[PDB]
Structure formats: structure tokens, C-alpha cells
Design a protein around this ligand. Sequence first.
Ligand SMILES: Nc1ncnc2c1ncn2[C@@H]1O[C@H](COP(=O)(O)OP(=O)(O)O)[C@@H](O)[C@H]1O
Ligand SMILES: O=P(O)(O)OC[C@H]1O[C@H](O)[C@H](O)[C@@H](O)[C@@H]1O
Length: 317
Amino acid sequence: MSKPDRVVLIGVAGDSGCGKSTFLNRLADLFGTELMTVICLDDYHSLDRKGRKEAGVTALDPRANNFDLMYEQVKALKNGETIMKPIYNHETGLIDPPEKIEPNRIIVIEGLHPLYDERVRELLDFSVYLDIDDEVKIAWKIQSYEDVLASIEARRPDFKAYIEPQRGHADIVIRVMPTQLIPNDTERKVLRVQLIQREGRDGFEPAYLFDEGSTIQWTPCGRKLTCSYPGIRLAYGPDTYYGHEVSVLEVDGQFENLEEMIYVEGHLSKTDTQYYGELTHLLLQHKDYPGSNNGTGLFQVLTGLKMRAAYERLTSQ
Ligand SMILES: Nc1ncnc2c1ncn2[C@@H]1O[C@H](COP(=O)(O)OP(=O)(O)O)[C@@H](O)[C@H]1O
Ligand SMILES: O=P(O)(O)OC[C@H]1O[C@H](O)[C@H](O)[C@@H](O)[C@@H]1O
């Protein structure tokens, strides 16, 4: 029967090893496993692992995915309709018989091409893109320089042709970069992280520092917070990005204790937390998650808070 329910559709774009499973685990801390259903878009591969090898294409290739079928079932789910979704088996590399997916209050589609097809794009209510510099992405996989570099060098043509342009369509881009606080760094364990927040989505107001419309460089270490060198550095300001207006929040360095975390949170505006300290609580809820001490975990939680705010906004009427 007809319903007043508004199913909210969310997209998470990125390659593997880009913190995507970590990000989805943090979203579970905010929504739970009950009313959120997560769909790995690899299920819409048209070619299985042996098929892609014999056709000579990677999984990044659009000719190895069925966007007609993806759009059919995502649209059906958003109409409160039950679907029979195929299953891609990452172990055996095969496309297994389908399973029954029931519509939920929140549908999150995640994978390589959630923002690639305009038909699916029009269905999404909010989206992220996890952007990892080839420098940082190389450092994560290596933690053999030669063999990894070759691995990411073979995939980059497909990546820049089909994957990277999705950044222009995301409401939020989480960009991970090498640090600027350490001269000639080798390990890439300290990270400079940016939260690129697009202007345009109807109710989505960006988190900011001090003044939402202007540019600030801020070092929180001082008379009220002690840090060891090099410390923490933050930035905020308007900018343009793929021809659209954005608000960029930035953080560089590591949090070495809880006091530095709550100090930064207390000085951020419009984080959409529901109580003072919720950002720090969620960030420390899983100490083992990678990035729990720097800007990657911080901005993942912040992005989820924006999704929660977009969800509560869409389901208020
Ligand atoms: N913020 C981060 N800091 C350091 N390493 C990370 C971070 N996010 C991801 N990684 C590395 O990537 C690997 C896979 O992480 P995961 O979130 O499962 O990526 P995906 O879900 O895209 O496969 C992890 O084992 C970790 O080594
Ligand atoms: O090298 P590719 O064709 O991109 O495949 C990389 C991986 O993609 C898929 O999503 C599965 O995880 C594996 O079946 C495969 O190894």
C-alpha cells in the first residue's frame, strides 16, 4: 500500500583501500543495521572476474557494469518496491543467483560508479567521494614500492577517465593528502585532510571555522592547549571546485590525546552534532578504525552527521 515514508538514498563513491568500509562502519554507528541497508554496486557487474580478464578490462571500466539494471533496481527500491538483486562473489569472482532486497528507510549504494550515471545521480539524496592522493594511496598499500606503484599505475587511466570525474557531482569530497607540517616526509602517516562541501543541496549547510563566508588559518595549539611539534593546523574558506561553489574545511596533523580532539570540536560550527562532544565520542567509539587520530576519521564522522541531518530533514515532512 501507499506510504507517507520517504526512503532516503545515499551514495558513497571510491576505490578500495580508500577507507570505504571504515566509513560505512562509522555510518552504522549513526544509523544502525536496522533501518539502513547497504548495497555494494559490484553486484551490478555485467562481467565476472574471468569475463573481465578475457575481455581485457578492469572493474573500473563502464563496459563491465550494467547501469541499466542498476538504475532499474535503485529506482524500484526508492519507490518502496522489493527487488531481486544479483550478487557478485568477491571470493569466487562469480555472479551468484540473486537475493531479495526489501526497501528500507535509508538505502546506501557504495562502490566505484554511484555518481557515474545521470539516471542514478538524479535519485540520490546525498553523496560522498573518498579522494586519496596517489601519494597517500601508495603509502597505505605499501604499509614494496616498485610493485604497488606499478599496480596503481596500471589502474590510473581507467581511474581518471571513469572514477575521478564523479568528484564534481558529490555533495562532500573527503580528500586525503600528504602533510605540510613535516619537511620531506617518507611514511605518509601524518595526513592533510580536506572536507570539500558543495553548495546547492537544498538543506545542506556546511560546517565551518569562525566565519562561514571567509578564509581562516588556525593553529589551536597555544595558551589553552599544549601540543608537541609539529602539532595540529586547521583551515577553512570558500572556494570553487569543478565550477561549483564549495566550503572547504581542512585539518593537518595528528591528535595525540582527547583534549586536542574536544578542543577542535568545540571550535567548529554547524557540525550537526546533537550534544557537545558527540563528534569526539563517535570518533573514539572505535579506536582501532584507521584514521581515528587524524582528519580522516574526523571528517568521516562529520560527513555522517551531515547525512543524518539530511535524513532528518527529508523525513520531517
Ligand atoms: N584513514 C586511514 N588511515 C590509514 N590507513 C587507511 C585509512 N583508511 C583506509 N586505510 C587502509 O586501507 C585498508 C582498507 O581499508 P577499508 O576501509 O577496508 O578500505 P575499503 O573499504 O575501500 O576496502 C586498511 O587496512 C588500511 O590499511
Ligand atoms: O583487476 P580488476 O578487474 O579491477 O579486479 C579487481 C577486483 O574487482 C572485483 O570487485 C573483485 O574484488 C575481484 O573479483 C577483482 O580481483
